[PDB]
Amino acid sequence: GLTRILPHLYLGSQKDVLNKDLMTQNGISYVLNASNSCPKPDFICESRFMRVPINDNYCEKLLPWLDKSIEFIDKAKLSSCQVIVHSLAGISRSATIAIAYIMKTMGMSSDDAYRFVKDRRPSISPNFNFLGQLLEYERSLKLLAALQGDP
């Protein structure tokens, strides 16, 4: 069920990322693993791997990992490479990271970015706690932009 979100950005599950043939077939060399329990695939290089060590629940905190996750995805983009963002099921933790990436990159509202990812991977269903952290993330980007002279 591997989903291409942008040409350099895929969203998927643990089963996707551990499928060597699927990964090699699609030339995916970077992995952003949003989980504590999912393993790095043996066939992925440490320098092309990043973990966001979070559990999927109503109290887990994703906010301060968002800017570094986005930076990682842009490192792949600069290297002309594709990155997959995944968690266990690829419907909550990883999905929220993909949504935040689109928000920041395109200056899209959290509503529109959620819909953008949801349209391409209809199975996503991020828990409300993560969706709320997206709202707070957007609020903070708007204040950062304000300082840059963009009210």
Curated annotation (Swiss-Prot):
Cystine pairs: none
The Tyrosine-protein phosphatase domain, residue ranges: 1-143
Subcellular location: Cytoplasm; Nucleus
Tissue expression from the record: Abundant in brain, heart and skeletal muscle.
Superkingdom of source: Eukaryota
Active site, per annotation: S87 (phosphocysteine intermediate)
Family note: Belongs to the protein-tyrosine phosphatase family. Non-receptor class dual specificity subfamily.
Oligomeric and partner information: Monomer.
Protein purpose: Has phosphatase activity with synthetic phosphatase substrates and negatively regulates mitogen-activated protein kinase activity, presumably by catalysing their dephosphorylation. Expected to display protein phosphatase activity toward phosphotyrosine, phosphoserine and phosphothreonine residues.
Protein name: Dual specificity protein phosphatase 8
Protein's organism: Homo sapiens
